[PDB]
Write a structure and sequence with these properties.
Chain A: It comes from Synechocystis sp. (strain ATCC 27184 / PCC 6803 / Kazusa). This is part of a larger assembly, with 2 copies of chain A. By secondary structure, chain A is an all-alpha fold. Chain A contains 2 helices and no strands.
Chain lengths: 54, 53
């Protein structure tokens, strides 16, 4: 359960990098900055699940 | 969202049951080494046939 949660967050973090790239090709800085804040917070929840899994 | 949580917890129970089935073979050396030897010897036989061809 905690390993599949870690996989779900780590693929979602890569989907927020895809959303950040799409915001940069659109030219929307506020959406690119929100997508960075989504990556920062979701990689922290991934690290919490990885610590619990360890 | 509520019905998706029931689907999620059912698939988590399948993953825990799958992990328990894998743990029944973990450290069970006789079946673990038998499966490894069957796979290894099957690949070596396929490569021996490829070298003969």
């Amino acid at each position: 359960r905690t390993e599949q949660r870690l996989n779900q967050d780590t693929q979602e973090a890569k989907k927020w990098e895809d959303r950040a790239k799409l915001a940069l090709t659109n030219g929307e800085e506020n959406l690119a900055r929100e997508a960075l804040a989504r990556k920062k917070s979701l990689t922290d929840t991934a690290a919490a699940y990885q610590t619990q899994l360890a | 969202a509520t019905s998706a949580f029931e689907r999620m917890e059912n698939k988590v129970l399948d993953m825990e049951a799958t992990s328990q089935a894998a743990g029944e073979l973990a450290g069970f050396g006789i079946e673990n080494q038998f499966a490894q030897l069957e796979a290894s010897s099957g690949v070596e036989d396929e490569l021996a046939a490829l070298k003969a061809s």
